[PDB]
Amino acid sequence: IIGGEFTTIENQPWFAAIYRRHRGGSVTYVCGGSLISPCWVISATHCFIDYPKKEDYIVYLGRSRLNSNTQGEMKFEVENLILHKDYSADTLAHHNDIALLKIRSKEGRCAQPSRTIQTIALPSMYNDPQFGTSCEITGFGKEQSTDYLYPEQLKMTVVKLISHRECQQPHYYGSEVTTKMLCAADPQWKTDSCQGDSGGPLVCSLQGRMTLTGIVSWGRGCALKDKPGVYTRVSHFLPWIRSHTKE
């Protein structure tokens, strides 16, 4: 997250922190995700497409810090790693960038809701907030495009939804953006998601309910003029989520 503010998991208790174990034993951060039911975390296919083996991954819930334990956190193996069969990558602009992780502890359990672990509601089909709506994004991604390190403490910020009409302009992203994607940015371009925020939640208040409107997917750079963040439009994938969460 470029700009915005530090936070803790109590302010985003569906946030899932996803790591990969290497040959070696060394564990590195991959991407964010969102708990949508006790046994299911939703994230982005691009986070996993090059290493699709479920055994490589560790998921934490209730975690506020990147490389230190948070009191009350839960650790999970990935029982199933489900990528979208129609995933496609340009040089930028991923299509169908959505993935499901079925989570299971060493003791064979799913998430147990607590003060630090809660699910996020899915939107109604084709039901998104109007352009200009303020939404929040959360993650452990870079604080500056030029940084080498990820922040140790979770961050969040606020970005405004951009219409497909505005985002499809040549001087924005042209044909790279589809109606299955949502653009969001700061009016001064001063705050944004960035590398390592992928897979995490774009949350909007819709009819008074906190709703997973988007999943961090792609963008050109971070906090750049006329280059919004691009998010998987969750409200266009409800049948895919409905079917694959029965696996």
């Binding site: 691009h46 990558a89 050109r220 971070c222």
Partner: peptide, 12 residues
């Protein structure tokens, strides 16, 4: 490789 979209990619 410094952008959102290319996390955990072999070529990076």
């Amino acid at each position: 490789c410094s952008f959102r979209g290319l996390e955990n990619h072999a070529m990076c």
